[PDB]
Amino acid sequence: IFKPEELRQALMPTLEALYRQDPESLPFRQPVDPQLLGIPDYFDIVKNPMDLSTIKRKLDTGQYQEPWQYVDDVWLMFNNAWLYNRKTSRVYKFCSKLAEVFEQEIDPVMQSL
Numbered sequence: 001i002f003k004p005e006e007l008r009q010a011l012m013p014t015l016e017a018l019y020r021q022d023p024e025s026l027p028f029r030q031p032v033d034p035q036l037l038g039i040p041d042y043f044d045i046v047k048n049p050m051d052l053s054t055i056k057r058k059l060d061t062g063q064y065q066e067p068w069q070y071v072d073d074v075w076l077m078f079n080n081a082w083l084y085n086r087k088t089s090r091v092y093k094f095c096s097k098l099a100e101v102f103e104q105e106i107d108p109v110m111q112s113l
């Protein structure tokens with residue numbers, strides 16, 4: 001049902017819109033490293049890390065066979081941030097901006113797929 005490069009082309013603009021957000025995408029561009037970042041409890045709360053570079057890689061390398069799998073990863077990133085961080089923290093607020101953007105982008109792309 002989905003050809004890999006077609007699925008990529010359809011979904012990529014939604015990911016590019018997330019990356020366009022500056023400064024809001026900045027905490028989300030790279031995988032969380034808890035040791036490095038001085039947040040060692042992180043993997044105890046967040047069992048399934050996700051970030052924009054991992055989503056991009058997966059979208060580039062045919063790791064999503066159906067569009068819902070991509071959407072699940074984007075929400076996993078967001079839900080991880082909303083679980084881990086204080087509501088008025090930069091990361092939480094930045095997360096919320098990305099999710100707003102995503103919801104605006106994804107609806108018609110999904111309808112069209």
Ligand SMILES: C[C@@H]1CC(=O)Nc2ccccc2N1
Binds near residue numbers: 032039080081084
């Ligand atoms: C997104 C990444 C991990 C997180 O959710 N919170 C956080 C806490 C301290 C430094 C960086 C982050 N960013």
